[PDB]
Structure 1
């Protein structure tokens, strides 16, 4: 689909068998989701954005479904004000910036 940018490009994602809603961030290297219950063993990490670095829990090989498309990638879980779909996954559903 073609998403314009007059409204925040929010997209519904199904991850962990839960229904969420995520921002499509092209400035985000990683996909960082809010706090939630996720299966498997993880590892502690630290990411930075405008404002500072946050300690997030990292998960690899994680299936997620953004607007119907499936993609198995690494998801960071931490105190993010909004779910963020970054390039690690945006590339998997084949997303482009056309202007």
Structure 2
């Protein structure tokens, strides 16, 4: 589809057998999701933006479905104010910016 930017580009995703809402975020290097109890091992990481850094748990090779498009890759989990699908997964669904 085509998504205009009048409002936040929020879409439904499916991750770990759960449905959530997330932003399609071209400004996010990596996908970051609200606190959720995913199984498997993980690695500590800190990610920075406006306001400073938050601590997140890095899970690798996580399957996510974004508008029926499947992708699998890194998912960071932590106390983020919003769920963002970052470029690491946006590339996998064929997402481009166009003007």
Give the structure-1-normalised TM-score.
0.98
- Structure 1 residue 75: Cα displacement: 0.2
- Structure 1 residue 37: Cα displacement: 1.5
Distance 1:59 1:36 in 2: 11
Aligned length: 99
Distance 1:67 1:21 in 2: 11
Moved over 6 A (4+): none
Pairing 1:1-99 to 2, within 5 Å after superposition: 1-99=1-99
- Structure 1 residue 78: Cα displacement: 0.5
Give the structure-2-normalised TM-score.
0.98
Name the SS of the counterpart of 2:93 in structure 1. coil
Cα-Cα RMSD: 0.5
